[PDB]
Amino acid sequence: KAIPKDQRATTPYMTKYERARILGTRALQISMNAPVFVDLEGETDPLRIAMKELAEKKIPLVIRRYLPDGSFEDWSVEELIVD
Template identity: 85%
Template structure:
């Protein structure tokens, strides 16, 4: 119908050259070089209440959807309580 007018081979030449171009843009670093791993941190080592709420909520949702639990359960069934126990 609407697609009958379009040639099927249109634009395939560009796709065939993608692999060749992709290999030219890759730069492999020697194992001795690291990228800025020893720079001083500019963030605090503490989690804000907003970050904590986000992490706990996300993990509680994962636990509620039957994700494996990373701590020993002592009768807890509430996903949020389990997430809090994991975070500690």
């Protein structure tokens, strides 16, 4: 039932699955004409643009980590420490 921010006791590191689905969904949105928040260096492939947004944490998403008891947490990808 939405655990508050002071009680979030999950791993602050972004896993490979979270990075994978964030890059996949973000790249899918970029392929569907989504507003890009980072200036492009001449890229054409959507996955490279998604990784470019992840490298600067400009992806506007938040992860709803489901807990085994039915609860969940909201860890934004901007505050998640990548790698």
